[PDB]
Amino acid sequence: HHHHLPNITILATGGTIAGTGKVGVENLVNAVPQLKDIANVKGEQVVNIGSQDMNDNVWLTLAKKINTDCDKTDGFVITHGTDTMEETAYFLDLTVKCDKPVVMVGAMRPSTSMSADGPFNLYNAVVTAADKASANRGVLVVMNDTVLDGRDVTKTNTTDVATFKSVNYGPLGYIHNGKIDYQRTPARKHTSDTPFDVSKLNELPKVGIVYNYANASDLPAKALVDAGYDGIVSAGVGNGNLYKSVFDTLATAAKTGTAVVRSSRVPTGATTQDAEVDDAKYGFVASGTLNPQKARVLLQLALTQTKDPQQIQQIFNQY
Amino acid sequence: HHHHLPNITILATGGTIAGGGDSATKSNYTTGKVGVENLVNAVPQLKDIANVKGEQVVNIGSQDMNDNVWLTLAKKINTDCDKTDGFVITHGTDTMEETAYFLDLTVKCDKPVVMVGAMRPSTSMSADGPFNLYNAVVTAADKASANRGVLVVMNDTVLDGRDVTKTNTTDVATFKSVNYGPLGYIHNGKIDYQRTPARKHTSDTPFDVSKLNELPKVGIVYNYANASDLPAKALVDAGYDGIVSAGVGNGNLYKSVFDTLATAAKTGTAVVRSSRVPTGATTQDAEVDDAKYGFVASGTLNPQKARVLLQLALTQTKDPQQIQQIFNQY
Amino acid sequence: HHHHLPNITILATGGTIAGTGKVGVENLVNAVPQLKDIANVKGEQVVNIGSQDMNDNVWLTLAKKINTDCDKTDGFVITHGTDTMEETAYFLDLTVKCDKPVVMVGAMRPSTSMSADGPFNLYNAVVTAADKASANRGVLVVMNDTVLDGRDVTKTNTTDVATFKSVNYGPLGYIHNGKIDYQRTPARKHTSDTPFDVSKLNELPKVGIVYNYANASDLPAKALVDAGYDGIVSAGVGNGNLYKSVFDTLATAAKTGTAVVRSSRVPTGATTQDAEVDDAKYGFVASGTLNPQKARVLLQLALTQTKDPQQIQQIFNQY
Amino acid sequence: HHHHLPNITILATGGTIAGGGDSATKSNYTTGKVGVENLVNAVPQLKDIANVKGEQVVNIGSQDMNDNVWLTLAKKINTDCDKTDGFVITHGTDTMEETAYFLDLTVKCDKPVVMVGAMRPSTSMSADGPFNLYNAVVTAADKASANRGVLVVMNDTVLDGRDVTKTNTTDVATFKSVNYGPLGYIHNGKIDYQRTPARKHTSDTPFDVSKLNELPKVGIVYNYANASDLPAKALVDAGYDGIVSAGVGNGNLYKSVFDTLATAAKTGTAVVRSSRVPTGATTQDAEVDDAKYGFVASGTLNPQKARVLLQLALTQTKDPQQIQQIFNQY
Ligand SMILES: N[C@@H](CC(=O)O)C(=O)O
Ligand SMILES: N[C@@H](CC(=O)O)C(=O)O
Ligand SMILES: N[C@@H](CC(=O)O)C(=O)O
């Protein structure tokens, strides 16, 4: 018998954890020599960008690489910027078909700063990826000693190391002394339980986001309609409500080939049916607890399958 | 000596507080439907605490709030300040945080101005509106409420108009001052105030809307992965005075949005970096060199709040350094 | 065919929802005539008390009554004071063997007050008890349009209608328009998956709680030891830490027949092993995310099975 | 003209900030082990911002904090006020909220007094202590910090000593002012203060500990279902000066605890109702008739904080009406 440690692959994309997006994956790994106590780590550099410039091409690269490399490794850690980690995490949650752990991690302070968070965050992300109990929970985010599901996780504060929270349904488990006590798992369908298959796609449907506020301009929504966008997500006020002129434009869009999802600029809670807006009349879809950027992720993937608003609403009710 | 109650004026604007549906249990309803009289008569205890007069200013959902209603309200409060002891504004919850900050910067009346709404319509089981209205009147009637700026009173809490925001789509407890906390809590019709806002408000600002017929055009663009530049270009093509960016993280911009706004700022469009992230400041001295591009950092002002201050800044100046000073003081 | 509504039993115990503990169950039910749209409701008055005077005898009555009456009804709602609802809920979570919904509800404002919360809270508690998806999730608390598990739920604010929160792991689902979208279920073992069986017990082991703070007196802990308590839970400072003189007394207690659990006065997070206290040396048990009052519930039930600290720690790791 | 840095004195008391373990990754450690010099030298940037002098007052876990250390610290700060520009107190996190409020009521020095600790030991990977100490020194050096009472600086946040509390057992972000919010946030070594505490602190209180050798004996009892009266009776039998009840909900007491404390209050023991509930006030005019029993309602003071004010109240008075007035003003 020989004691064996799991093989973990780090897929590096950039971020302040490498600051954004300057230091290579080898350098990050070598800065945390205690990783050798818990895993055999191999690093690959996918891209080296600020996540404020994350895009559809990188999402598709990452999903295809994890799906292709699933059988070569025991788990994955993705180093990423914090700004759009919540978007990438949910894209991968819906398109990764590997049910081995896939864990995303970043840092709110650069590697050079006093009390930098990145080293311990990376250690705990590898702990999570190495834990057999992490499998079959979907794509995870590990930040500030917490395991968060890719669907609900969001950046709640501009600078706090403790910014990442699952604001509607809470975390899956807490990490202490290199161990996780998992008390929850996401009930929405993820990974191999979704129909989304991006293995042959080179691009995704065009989906844009418009913001609502007092005296809102309809010019952004008209610009997306004039460009023939596939979908528009509204960052509505309150329970997904729309300023009158935005409502007029989106009502046109939904009857003229553009899928419309009502989400909310409000940071917690669902955008529901059965409140002030008759979604069925207008052909709109209610986003539930998906915030605008997350609702975009699912609307792009829905539009790979269907343009029918009723079928899109059912997708928004299952994933 | 005889006890006299304060005179409180209710300026009604609509909202779910004035909403109705056909069932106490079904969620479906129409906002901004019931008049101010019906609201007042649903709270018979109000006569214990004030002499209430109701005026219907408009009756709309606050999803359709607009600059004209803002100007009407500021001018009415500043005109009528000497006729009453305090004001309550019944309003929708969806943009209450915007109206409250606009009034906090433009009201010159030293008397309490309190905004209130309801997350459940007037027809619903356990409707929140009646007690919210009672507590708003308590707050407007309390002499300790004066000189604290425009207030929002929701769920037994007195919140400053600058920091207060709607945090949850459905919860009666939605309104929170997420960066600096509430000013006071209300129990049994009494307030223990432990805080007051330090940023300049009301008669300490230079903003005077008494003779304005309209406000500068300021739009908001969202940032996210693969963000389109088409919204930003549409506001620039229309000659907008200002654009507020709902940035990712600490006010960061997707590169194609950054490019459009950098070009606009060079032509004289005012550009404020705010954040889609619901708490925390958009700072200077992070990843964007504001001075180089002619941008302004919003600090703790979220995108819709930063729009309010940017519109008022543009009544005074187009210079980015002067607008940043405004964003550091109000 | 005939459309049939579920049979729901309301077991009334008191509370402000009946204000505390003055109005009878019939009166509460008749104040919400819309209950007839969703259930056939029958009410029984178990006791009529302020939950600040909740006690072991009422817990045992309730567990035996639900276990006995399980086959007569489709679901249970328990009307209760808010002050110790979190304790009763977790006791029932560990001792109820009915896997039909068991839902606890209260009110923060009395029935007579402006904008009283009780009516809609009771409506939503019956919605929850009538929903087939509520089964097999353990004992639930329904407050402020939210379904909360009995283990994690706690009262977070002295007066707020929104006081009840599952502060470590979040809620199970949100209620809108008489429907629940459940996204979570508790992983700790509950109800028919626990060994605790109170069917023949007339009393529970004596377990008391001591508080830690600067310059803490050891007199409370000595008083419980001198009375021969079966167990003591410490409301420790920080990560379950003990003031020196309290530590001295509890170290004695644990070697002299008294089970000692370290919990925390801190409102969120676990009291862990492997920090400053060598639990194994002293024979102490770490409470994890169980706050002092919840740790008391599980320590009483553990002491029905075992007095061995290692077996008590395993119970604290599974339930 | 030449730039001069402020003189800041670090009074070290121990804590996890001074803790050590034998591994950077294992959780096991010992508190209050490393001396103040080693802490200062772990933050080489401190010379950019202050002239730092360290004094080791004690080296203990704050789980073993006590009245003697409180009196030492208050007397030392009040004696040494003219020798320095500001103070930082390195301390354990577990009872930092208690020490901070005691100093907030007894320090008469008008200069900044800032408390700081660390949730991870000095030996741990990504230890929080170094940047926390840097930010504490920033806060103590900032002239805008003065006259705000005793402060706690943790996780880039400036918190008032009255409202601040430890909310989480393990998280670096644990310290929050859960009722009224923080005073300011720290970014790039700068603070934007937007709040100051209204309750009277420091030179505005009557509490003078300059000649005290000890403090009144005040104990804390917990309430829960089937609560034993044995803890309350043990403090009464020992002749305690005061007892604080960690009540259920809005300061309610299990009947047998209520009975013991009602009898004690009649003999002259001071009794404060607080709450085990982590946010919100323990109010008057709820289910307990305080006036009838001779009890005092703690308001937003949690049990350990209410103990601090009760000990100091008992240095001035034993009258329950005067103690309630103290609980309404400080
Ligand atoms: N802008 C950086 C921020 C971070 O990683 O903390 C990024 O998202 O790449
Ligand atoms: N849409 C409504 C929502 C509410 O008031 O709660 C409004 O803002 O007018
Ligand atoms: N003291 C009451 C409080 C409430 O129910 O809100 C009780 O627990 O019975």
Ligand SMILES: N[C@@H](CC(=O)O)C(=O)O
């Ligand atoms: N027990 C330690 C915990 C810490 O400082 O974080 C102390 O309070 O001294």
